[PDB]
Design a protein around this ligand. Structure first.
Ligand SMILES: [Mn+2]
Ligand SMILES: [Mn+2]
Length: 178
DNA sequence: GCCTTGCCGGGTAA
DNA sequence: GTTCCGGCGCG
DNA sequence: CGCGCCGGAACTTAC
DNA sequence: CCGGCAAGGC
């Protein structure tokens, strides 16, 4: 139940954010768990309290920074402990249980899927990661294909078959699993 | 006839 | 999305 | 001394 | 990410 919420946030983080190990001069350093998003509302009102809860549970001390940018808002937690918590979880992604599979995919979709829903698509330059989401989806009964969408930027797309749309939306985008 | 989906360019939201 | 900056906290 | 949080912001491009 | 084009399947 903390694993699930983590799985979700990790999707957002990979999708619209980053994991940053900075080195300064010196020998100063910083470690950031970052999700950036356009709706200063969404961040403050849905993403942040999820992350907050995780922070409290992992007994992390860092605060949640929300920095206004020109084009988007940025949720940022500066924390060595949290950085490694996510980075480590990333390397272990292939072993996600079902609950986490679903949560991670939902987070990834919310960050960079087709949100119009006229089509079901997930974009990403990381074929290997799409490959893993593809296998999980095949196991959930949701057919799909991967090809290179954007020849310009090396960006792949995972196309979910509208044949299986209900299954995908009802058991993933509309899941209460947390 | 109707639907699905690969393909590709614009530029918002990362 | 990624990485510069200056500044501060801490043992 | 040596690292790790904070608050921002320019610079960059993958969706 | 969007969204229009047109090929291809039933
Ligand atoms: Mn991404
Ligand atoms: Mn997004």
């Amino acid at each position: 139940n903390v694993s699930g919420i983590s799985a979700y946030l990790l999707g957002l983080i990979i999708g619209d954010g980053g994991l940053y190990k900075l080195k300064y001069k010196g020998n100063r350093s910083e470690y950031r768990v970052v999700i950036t998003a356009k709706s200063e509302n969404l961040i403050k009102q849905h993403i942040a309290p999820l992350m907050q809860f995780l922070i409290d549970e992992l007994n992390v001390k860092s605060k949640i920074q929300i920095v206004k940018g020109d084009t988007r808002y940025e949720l940022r937690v500066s924390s060595k402990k949290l950085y490694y918590y996510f980075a480590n979880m990333l390397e272990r992604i292939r072993l996600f249980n079902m609950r986490e599979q679903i949560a991670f995919i939902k987070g990834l979709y919310v960050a960079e899927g087709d949100m119009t829903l006229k089509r079901l698509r997930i974009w990403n330059k990381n074929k290997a990661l799409l490959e893993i989401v593809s296998r999980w989806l095949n196991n959930l009964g949701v057919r799909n294909t991967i090809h290179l969408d954007d020849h310009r930027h090396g960006v792949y797309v995972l196309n979910i078959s509208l044949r299986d749309r209900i299954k995908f939306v009802h058991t993933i985008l509309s899941s209460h699993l947390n």
